[PDB]
Amino acid sequence: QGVNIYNISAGTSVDLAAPVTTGDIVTFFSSALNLNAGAGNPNNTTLNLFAENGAYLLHIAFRLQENVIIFNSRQPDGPWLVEQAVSDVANQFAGIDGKAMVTVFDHGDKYQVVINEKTVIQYTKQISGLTSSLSYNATEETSIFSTVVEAVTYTGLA
Amino acid sequence: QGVNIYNISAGTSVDLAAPVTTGDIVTFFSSALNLNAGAGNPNNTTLNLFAENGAYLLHIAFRLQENVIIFNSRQPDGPWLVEQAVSDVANQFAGIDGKAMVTVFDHGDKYQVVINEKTVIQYTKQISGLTSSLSYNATEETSIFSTVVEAVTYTGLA
Ligand SMILES: CC(=O)N[C@H]1[C@@H](Oc2ccc([N+](=O)[O-])cc2)O[C@H](CO)[C@H](O)[C@@H]1O[C@@H]1O[C@H](CO)[C@H](O)[C@H](O)[C@H]1O
Ligand SMILES: CC(=O)N[C@H]1[C@@H](Oc2ccc([N+](=O)[O-])cc2)O[C@H](CO)[C@H](O)[C@@H]1O[C@@H]1O[C@H](CO)[C@H](O)[C@H](O)[C@H]1O
């Protein structure tokens, strides 16, 4: 078992030293929380788990203006697949201010997403595979998280 | 599976909403790092996993003056057991400044301790059982970590 730490500036991605597979965990840590950020176009912030081939295994989109969190997947150079949506952004974060954490458990055929201590969705995968890189995209203006998001992975758990 | 967050002021402990058992994980996060803190008496900082009966399942002691990290266990109202020691404190933290994280994996008959990304010890348990509370002890003067340490547990993984 191992712990890997990464620092992700908004708009960039990182390649993992250890891939995330079934039974593994990834937690994104934000040193800030701005639920009053400007409107998204349409996203304020997105967090993503990528396959080495470029596929979007899991796409987490926070949209304040639409007050919802979208979950989707997408083949390397393909169209976005079936969107799953959880309504009420601020409710998922309630209980903790000025910071936040987003955790994704890889349960084989589903991705469990947890905001702080709250389970937000049991996302049935539309695309399977090993997560080889992670990303955090947003503008320095309308992101709900800090400029740099810390990612910690817990691998080789199974 | 669930995520639980706790904030631990130095010298206090917290009771877990979800106990940590075999296959589970606990990570202590410090917002500071002072490897130049005053001498310990003999500990500068200790992090602990407790059983509900008060037993010290795992005791992690950081001693700058002795430049070593001690690992031990202790029955509720019993003597300290066999000490395990890893030498060179600062080396375990090398690579990251101003902050740190300490992770403990409960592997059934052993506790794996990881400082940041470095595995420090594969502690063979001297006392088994469920971890029901965690603590972070130190003086506001000679602690190597921040005044408040954030603890995150990942339970129900097995
Ligand atoms: C701008 C916007 O709200 N895009 C949404 C919208 O789809 C469109 C596409 C084009 C236009 N337009 O030319 O005016 C408007 C809306 O709804 C889609 C779902 O039906 C998407 O939500 C789309 O945003 C895209 O969502 C995907 C994830 O599904 C991903 O987050 C993309 O980055 C995002 O643009
Ligand atoms: C002060 C000190 O260095 N204590 C150490 C030492 O044991 C003693 C006990 C008493 C005296 N004394 O009356 O002068 C000096 C030293 O070595 C022990 C191991 O052989 C311990 O390391 C002890 O510290 C205690 O360690 C345990 C864990 O084993 C725990 O961290 C206690 O909080 C700590 O005091």
From Swiss-Prot, chains A, B:
Coiled-coil ranges (or none): none
Pfam families per the UniProt record, alphabetical: Gal-bind_lectin
Keyword Hydrolase on entry: yes
Annotated keywords: Apoptosis, Hydrolase, Lectin, Nuclease
Location of Blocked amino end (Gln) modifications: 1
Disulphide-bridged cysteine pairs: none
A biological process term (GO) from this entry: apoptotic process
Lineage: Eukaryota, Fungi, Dikarya, Basidiomycota, Agaricomycotina
Protein source organism: Cyclocybe aegerita (Black poplar mushroom)
Name of this chain's protein: Anti-tumor lectin
Annotated Galectin domain residues: 12-155
